[PDB]
Design a protein around this ligand. Structure first.
Ligand SMILES: CNC(=O)c1cccc(COc2cc(C(=O)O)ccc2-c2nn(C(=O)c3c(Cl)cccc3C(F)(F)F)c3ccc(Cl)cc23)c1
Ligand SMILES: CNC(=O)c1cccc(COc2cc(C(=O)O)ccc2-c2nn(C(=O)c3c(Cl)cccc3C(F)(F)F)c3ccc(Cl)cc23)c1
Lengths: 258, 258
């Protein structure tokens, strides 16, 4: 509630976020813009360059399986970040699981934007860069499955948030009291109110020329709710066709109840 | 510096909101709570008496559930016109590209109807006919085949939304923010719609602080409710689709086309 206490919370969440996530937005921006000789990624834009890149760093399943592996690693990183949110580990254990169950996808998408520009996405911890054209041009259902992630990222990235903002935003998402099945909504909201207070002040101080960025950033939490919906309705269709494909037990369990 | 300008905008939207809308939330609350007693519809027989007393302009299907459905349609058509006239009083709206005016209303009316319908609802039923009637939630929820499940989500939303305890002066600004959404599909000139929405957001923010000083982060919680609004309108149109395909004058068809 007091200003020094809110800045204190912001520093705690940023320092923790740096510790939980291996590749920040600031390092990703440095790789994506370039002018550097040491951080230059190998670019995959077609089938042949994908074969060479595996020596350096079916095709559509192999790329899909690559996304699965990272999303599982991301859920692990998000779970570790979540534990550091003051108050989270003190909630009813069922609500802990329930907040994570519905929060990871909205967060995975948000942080996936940090790795993208309009032309592609960083992979292999930034050693690689796979183009948007190549992904969107994958066959049958997989092409249309990759592109909405880019469509979201382009719009989210125009807000020009940095990592210090995202650490607080990611926390507000996790601590949503409107998830289905929560047992005690009140203590989750009390945490979110503080986190929101912390976000508002962080955004006011860090982005003082950006009018009403707080309101605009909460409205992006709208776009995320719908985009996760589309994602799970498209993934369900894809498993019905690709009898081979299987999902990591961690992702499996999140999607069992959607 | 701009604070008085924002209170002026809040008063401008409040005075207009009273003129545009037949039954305010403050008048509806007095009816539902007790402080001219309305006619109560709880079942089939009392519905026939209510239409035989109150002149339901919409009655020419002999079935009960279709006749209630058709009553909601007729009132929604009136609300679209009420919202359309209120929109003209939002500073800057009439100066927009006529196509953008049409587009903002086309995509906004549903979220607004849902929002203001909450003003007429409590956990036990809904006001109709300018407050002269009161139709119970049990009766509506228990209508047959798809009609029961179509009525109830509106109550489930209203109960949660009304927990914020907004009054008409708050709602006048909130409604305006919705209309002026710069992300509607097909807008030709987004900038001045966002420029107006930024003003409206500032005015809502200060209004909510002055009017609700004990309610922490109510501004945030109110924006988070526009999440609930996009999703429930999505389900709503997918439910109308099932009702048009399973159930059923071309002129009447044409009036209700949207
Ligand atoms: C051989 N190819 C690769 O190694 C590779 C190719 C392209 C992209 C990537 C990185 O992909 C992500 C990274 C991160 C991260 O580094 O934090 C986070 C997310 C993705 C990513 N999830 N996702 C999904 O579909 C997905 C999502 Cl959103 C959420 C939950 C579950 C899944 C999935 F299980 F079903 F995959 C993507 C779709 C398209 C794109 Cl472009 C990226 C992703 C590696
Ligand atoms: C003779 N009157 C009746 O028979 C009757 C029976 C029950 C309720 C009502 C009032 O109904 C509304 C009033 C107002 C208002 O006074 O401001 C505003 C909205 C409704 C109302 N729209 N809606 C819809 O379905 C709907 C919605 Cl949400 C949005 C857009 C379009 C539609 C529709 F076009 F498709 F109808 C309802 C569903 C359930 C309930 Cl309980 C109320 C409503 C009158």
């Amino acid at each position: 509630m007091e200003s020094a206490d809110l800045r204190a919370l912001a520093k705690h969440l940023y320092d923790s976020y740096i510790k939980s996530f291996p590749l920040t937005k600031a390092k990703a921006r440095a790789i994506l813009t370039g002018k550097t000789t040491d951080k230059s990624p190998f670019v995959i834009y077609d089938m042949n360059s994908l074969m060479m890149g595996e020596d350096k760093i079916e095709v559509a399943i192999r790329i899909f399986q690559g996304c699965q592996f990272r999303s599982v690693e991301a859920v692990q990183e998000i779970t570790e970040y979540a534990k550091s949110i003051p108050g989270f580990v003190n909630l009813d254990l069922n609500d802990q699981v329930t907040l994570l169950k519905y929060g990871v996808h909205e967060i995975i998408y948000t942080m996936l934007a940090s790795l993208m520009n309009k032309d592609g996405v960083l992979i292999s911890e930034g050693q690689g860069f796979m183009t948007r054209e190549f992904l969107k041009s994958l066959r049958k259902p997989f092409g249309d499955f990759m592109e909405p992630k880019f469509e979201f990222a382009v719009k989210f990235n125009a807000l020009e948030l940095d990592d210090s903002d995202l650490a607080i935003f990611i926390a507000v998402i996790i601590l949503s009291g409107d998830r289905p099945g929560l047992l005690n909504v009140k203590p989750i909201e009390d945490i979110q109110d503080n986190l929101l207070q912390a976000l508002e002040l962080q955004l006011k101080l860090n982005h003082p020329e950006s009018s009403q960025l707080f309101a605009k950033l909460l409205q992006k939490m709208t776009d995320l709710r719908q985009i996760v919906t589309e994602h799970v309705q498209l993934l369900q269709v894809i498993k019905k066709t690709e009898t081979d494909m299987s999902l990591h037990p961690l992702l499996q369990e999140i999607y069992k109840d959607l």
